[PDB]
Write a protein that binds this ligand. Structure first.
Ligand SMILES: Nc1cccc2c1C(=O)N([C@H]1CCC(=O)NC1=O)C2=O
Ligand SMILES: [Zn+2]
Ligand SMILES: [Zn+2]
Ligand SMILES: [Zn+2]
Lengths: 53, 346, 809
């Protein structure tokens, strides 16, 4: 609805609060399916899997 | 409670993708303001909105009114998140769904009536034995007397008593509730409704069935027909397969058990507002695990979850749970999502 | 399509009988209720003299006589099953006998659960009010004032919802109710004073904490004593205030007392009937005291003898009782002071033909005259019988057991009947009979040697033993009785030739019924021949379900198995081989055929139209109509129209849509006719009892009524429908009940006006009215004769059209 995080999809009020949080997703496989909890390494990987739900 | 056969215009929340059965509860999490203000205006007038039962695309032909009974605001991280619980009420067939400027589509629906039928013997019962139609109620020799006395007057028709028992509501539930006691050890005879209408609808929301069977029961109006169709599913569809590849058996009915007080299949919600009817089973087959167990937002406290997928088509079927302490039993079980399953007849 | 329904034989079973002084203050009347008919007799010295028979636009549900202060003779209160209330009076002007309606009204309540123990209607001894038990939790009170011609009433809130039986007590300071109810803490008797002033309940004279588990009957004992007698499964008690008696006579423990009748006005002798036909005398031992009082000392029960299975008893006079029977013939019995050598005080005087219940029937031309006779399985248990019905001549063949299905085998010149008798587990291995019956007394006998079903504990309960009986078509002597397998339940029966085989066989379809198993997983289709006086099994096919229904289908055998419809072929090796299966979601109870079309139906009025495809060797579903409601019988009127019998006592006709452009439209069958018959149809049957209209379907019902359904032209239907409205303006209806209300399609929840059906009984009564009323109904009535102009109809024109319609039965 506003400033969504690219990895876990959680939305934040401002872009300030978003990158305060975006530093939390540091890991070897950072993108999370907002339905499974399945984790992926690239944004596209998550996109394909997300659209198979 | 709307009127019967009447027409009403009822708002429709566009995020909902769930076939709601009367009496079943629908949990929701809403971030968008249009829908948040939509819930707030409902909690004043009627509290009811319409939940369409999708065939999917956007093709819906029946649905159910849903009534808000719970409401909680969390204003965390600068974003107003509203969690609201609804309960399904009356069935309807859709007439026109006019989509409105803000987004919420309005629906002209015809409120479906509930077909109540008299006993199958009320037509033939001899007036001299009306005086005997009330029994001192509850064993399986007891059920042998109930049939010999309730259907004594079958001797005046061209059918026996045992056929009439197969359309007797009271008999159908005792048979249905026999098998629910197999899925739930925490299940007392009083935990189940006594009305045949409400009882069929509760069983409708409890069975792990795909949308097609879930819709088919909604189209059924007489409770007798609902109960028999439900008892039929329970008996024939012993096996549960991957709804995607359709030939991969994930688990069977012998493995269904109840982990929480809420039964063998309750609606859980994940951190981002997705609802999962999660059937808890002992053993499961043809599943690949993904990742290492995590405890974040674990629906069953004390257990760590792990994503599970079909070995064949790689679809999402559910999660494997493991005990994080050691004194707990089961030390392991699987939470299977209902949208992923397809009951089958071996 | 448009249909015409006429009664060929009026309802014969009795559902009521009261005595009193309805015609003369000095005469003793016997009033008999026959569903829609009311009969009046006067009790004589020789027997019964008929006085007047009438029909109502209703099913008579309450029939009681009463005499409010200042009335010459007794009045008649009648309530119909659609809740038409009325008070009637007898008025004879020389030879003009007429039942006039002193008051009338409908007591139906929009709100309300119809009670489990049925409609109860009681009147207080002082004729001050009519008490009605219609719905749980309420009590309807019709106050009896000479200024209440509309029967306006009110309700009283009843705690205690499940009420068993209720009566007004005698000798009370205020109108008092006495009733037995059941709540969680056992079964009880309680009393409530009824205030017509405050229109509510006041405290009752007594309330007895607990009473017998199965206390089912409340008898109010008259003014010499007071109080009430409660009767149950094992005990008979008397309650009044602090007085109490109770007996547990072992003589009544063997069956349930289900009707009673007070003998004398002081209430010291009662007749009790049970479900097996025993007739008892209940005696109240009175003790004459030295002051003026009388005290009740004890209760005593004596077995009088045997009768028909009694729905109602009524003592006439001079030791003559009338036995009203639903399951068998009604009787006049005589009671004698000294019991005969056999130990019975009961002697038969007269019987009355009761065709009901007709559970199966078939039309035969035994006399080969192209006439046709109706042969029915009727009655149940020891009342069971065949009845041969002719144009109305009724012959009776006692069976002393329940016939279930019948069919005719012309080549063998005999009948084949599926039958059921009750036997009770013996102390040895087996089960011994209750009485000698057709099954047990044949010329030759056989038992199934099948052993197809090789892998419970009966105690002393009842079991059903099923037989195929071969009945000679001329003597009706049971030529052979074949007993089926233990726990086998014979369901369907057909006679026919199969394949290229010149033999005519009896085919029987069954189910294996075990009390542990809810739905049957096993059945048999057995092929019998019967050629040289002896009955031989010609192969048997095991099936995985109940064979509910069977039809000969174009030299093949069509059959239902649970939800499956299956076509069977007859090989040269004389056995059954499956050709094709059509699996349904509905359970295939009803199975009717016509050419290549097959009609399938279940108990909830799901109607299905399959068609056999000769080029593909398969079945194809043509159309469907589901409408949740109980169905009892169904039949094919022609390739396009299907007739059904559904709740409550309704007939319906669905049709294949002629306005079908979309394939969705062609797959739904439209309802084209609705009608309230007033009877519960057990079997339709194509055939006619005689030598304009097209088709002839007979049907038998539970009350023994036999009706005929035929189809009309649109020209004829439209005309006779105008007549119905015109005859209804001139025909005086007994309870002042509208015909259009009575024929309205009726559920416990729905009522829709009748349609597509013409009441043939109303049409035929055009001939019985006089020519002033006759010329009144024809006035301004245009008529589609051969000439394309529609001329006014003369009444003498209409005598000719109705006289032709009587010729169909
Ligand atoms: N932490 C995340 C993150 C994204 C999606 C999910 C979760 C998560 O825990 N669940 C489920 C699956 C496992 C479980 O028991 N509870 C949940 O909420 C998700 O769908
Ligand atoms: Zn994030
Ligand atoms: Zn996913
Ligand atoms: Zn798969």
């Amino acid at each position: 609805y506003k400033h969504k995080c690219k990895y876990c999809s959680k939305v934040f009020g401002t872009d300030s609060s978003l990158q305060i949080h975006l530093r939390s997703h540091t890991g070897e496989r950072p993108f999370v399916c907002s339905v499974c909890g399945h984790r992926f390494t690239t944004k596209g990987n998550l996109k394909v899997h997300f659209h198979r739900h | 409670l709307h009127d019967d056969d009447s027409c009403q215009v009822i708002p429709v929340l566009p995020q909902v993708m769930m076939i709601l059965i009367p009496g079943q509860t629908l949990p929701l999490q809403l971030f968008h303001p249009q829908e948040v203000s939509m819930v707030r205006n409902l909690i004043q007038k009627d509290r009811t909105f319409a939940v369409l039962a999708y065939s999917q695309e956007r093709e819906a032909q029946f649905g159910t009114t849903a009534e808000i009974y719970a409401y909680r605001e969390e204003q965390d991280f600068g974003i107003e998140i509203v969690k609201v619980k609804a309960i399904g009420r009356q069935r309807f067939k859709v007439l026109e769904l006019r989509t409105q400027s803000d987004g919420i589509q309005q629906a002209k629906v015809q409120i479906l009536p509930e077909c109540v039928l008299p006993s199958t013997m009320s037509a033939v019962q001899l007036e001299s034995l009306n005086k005997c139609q009330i029994f001192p109620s509850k064993s399986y020799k007891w059920w042998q007397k109930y049939q010999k006395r309730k259907f004594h007057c079958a001797n005046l028709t061209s059918w026996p008593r045992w056929l009439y028992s197969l359309y007797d509501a009271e008999t159908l539930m005792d048979r249905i509730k026999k098998q629910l006691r197999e899925w739930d050890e925490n299940l007392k005879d009083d935990s189940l409704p006594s009305n045949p209408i409400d009882f069929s609808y509760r069983v409708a929301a409890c069975l792990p069935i795909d949308d097609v069977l879930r819709i088919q029961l909604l189209k059924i109006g007489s409770a007798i027909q609902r109960l028999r169709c439900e008892l039929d599913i329970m008996n024939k569809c012993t096996s549960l397969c991957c709804k995607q590849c359709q030939e991969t058996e994930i688990t069977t009915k012998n493995e269904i058990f109840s982990l929480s007080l809420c039964g063998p299949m309750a609606a859980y919600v994940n951190p981002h507002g997705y609802v999962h009817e999660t059937l808890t089973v002992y053993k499961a087959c043809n599943l690949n695990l993904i990742g290492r167990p995590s405890t974040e937002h674990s629906w069953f406290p004390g257990y760590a979850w792990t994503v599970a997928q079909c070995k064949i088509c790689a679809s999402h079927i559910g999660w494997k749970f493991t005990a994080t302490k050691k004194d707990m039993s089961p030390q392991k079980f699987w939470g299977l999502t209902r949208s992923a399953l397809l009951p089958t007849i071996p | 399509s448009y249909n015409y329904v006429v009664t060929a034989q009026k309802p014969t079973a009795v559902n009521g009988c009261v005595t009193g002084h309805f015609t003369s203050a000095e005469d003793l009347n016997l009033l008999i209720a026959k569903n829609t008919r009311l009969e009046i007799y006067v009790v004589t010295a020789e027997g019964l003299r008929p006085v007047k028979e009438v029909g109502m636009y209703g099913k008579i549900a309450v029939m009681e006589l009463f005499r409010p202060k200042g009335e010459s003779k007794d009045l008649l209160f009648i309530l119909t099953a659609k809740y038409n209330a009325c008070i009637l009076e007898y008025k004879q002007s020389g030879e003009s006998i007429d039942i006039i309606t002193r008051a009338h009204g409908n007591v139906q309540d929009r709100i309300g659960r119809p009670s489990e123990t049925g409609i109860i209607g009681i009147i207080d001894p002082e004729c001050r009010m009519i008490g009605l038990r219609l719905y749980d939790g309420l009590f309807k009170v019709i106050p009896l004032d000479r200024d209440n011609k509309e029967l306006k009433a009110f309700n009283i809130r009843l705690e205690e919802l499940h009420v068993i039986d209720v009566k007004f007590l005698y000798g009370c300071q205020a109108p008092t109710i006495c009733f037995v109810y059941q709540d969680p803490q056992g079964r009880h008797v309680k009393t409530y004073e009824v205030s017509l002033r405050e229109k509510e309940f006041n405290k009752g004279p007594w309330k007895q904490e607990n009473v017998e588990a199965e206390a089912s009957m409340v008898i109010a004992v008259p003014e010499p004593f007071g109080g009430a007698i409660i009767i149950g499964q094992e005990s008979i008690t008397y309650h009044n205030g602090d007085k109490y008696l109770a007996i547990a006579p072992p003589i009544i423990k063997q069956s349930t007392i289900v009707c009673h009748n007070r003998v004398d006005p002081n209430g010291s002798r009662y007749l009790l009937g049970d479900m097996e036909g025993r007739l008892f005398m209940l005696l109240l031992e009175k003790e004459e005291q030295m002051d003026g009082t009388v005290t009740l000392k004890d209760l005593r029960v004596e077995l009088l003898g045997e009768t028909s299975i009694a729905e109602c008893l009524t003592y006439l006079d001079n030791g003559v009782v009338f036995v009203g029977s639903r399951l068998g013939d009604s009787q006049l019995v005589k009671l004698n002071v000294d019991s005969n050598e056999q130990g019975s005080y009961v002697v038969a005087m007269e019987t009355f033909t009761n065709l009901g219940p007709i559970v199966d029937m078939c039309v035969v031309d035994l006399e080969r005259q192209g006439q046709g006779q109706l042969v029915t399985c009727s009655g149940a248990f020891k009342e069971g019988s065949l009845r041969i019905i002719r144009n109305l001549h009724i012959r009776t063949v006692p069976l002393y057991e329940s016939p279930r299905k019948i069919c005719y085998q012309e080549v063998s010149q005999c009948f084949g009947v599926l039958s059921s008798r009750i036997e009770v587990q013996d102390t040895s291995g087996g089960t011994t009979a209750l009485r000698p019956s057709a099954s047990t007394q044949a010329l030759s006998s056989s038992v199934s040697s099948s052993k197809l079903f090789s892998s419970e504990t009966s105690f002393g309960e009842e079991v059903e033993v099923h037989n195929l009986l071969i009945i000679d078509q001329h003597t009706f002597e049971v030529l052979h009785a074949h007993q089926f397998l233990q726990n086998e339940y014979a369901l369907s029966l057909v006679s026919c030739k199969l394949g290229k085989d010149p033999n005519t066989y009896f085919i029987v379809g069954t189910a294996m019924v075990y009390p542990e198993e809810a739905e049957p997983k096993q059945g048999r289709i057995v092929v019998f021949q019967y050629s040289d006086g002896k009955l031989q099994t010609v192969a048997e096919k095991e099936v995985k379900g109940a064979v509910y229904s069977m039809v000969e289908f174009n030299g093949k055998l069509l059959a239902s198995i649970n939800s499956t419809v299956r076509l069977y072929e007859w090989t040269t090796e004389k056995e059954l081989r499956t050709e094709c299966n059509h699996y349904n979601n509905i359970m295939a109870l009803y199975l009717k055929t016509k050419g290549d079309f097959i009609l399938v139906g279940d108990l909830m009025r799901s109607v299905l139209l399959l068609a056999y495809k000769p080029m593909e060797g398969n079945f194809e579903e043509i159309a469907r109509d589901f409408n949740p409601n109980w169905m009892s019988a169904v039949e094919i009127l022609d390739d396009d129209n299907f007739l059904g019998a559904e709740n409550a006592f309704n007939l319906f006709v669905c049709q294949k849509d002629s306005a079908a452009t979309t394939d969705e439209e062609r797959q739904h069958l439209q309802e084209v006719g609705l009608f309230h018959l007033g009877e519960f149809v057990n079997v339709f049957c194509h055939g006619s009892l005689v030598m304009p209209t097209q088709g002839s379907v007979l049907f038998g019902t539970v009350n023994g009524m036999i009706g005929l359904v035929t189809s009309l032209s649109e020209s004829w239907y439209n005309l006779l429908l105008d007549m119905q409205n015109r005859l209804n303006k001139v025909i005086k209806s007994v309870g002042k009940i509208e015909h259009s209300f009575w024929r309205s399609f009726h559920t416990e929840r729905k009522t829709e006006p009748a349609t597509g059906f013409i009441d043939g009984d109303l049409i035929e009564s055009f001939l019985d009215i006089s020519r002033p009323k006759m010329q009144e109904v024809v006035a301004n009535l245009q008529y589609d004769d051969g000439s394309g102009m529609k001329r006014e109809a003369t009444a003498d024109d209409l005598i000719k059209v109705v006289e032709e319609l009587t010729r169909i039965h």
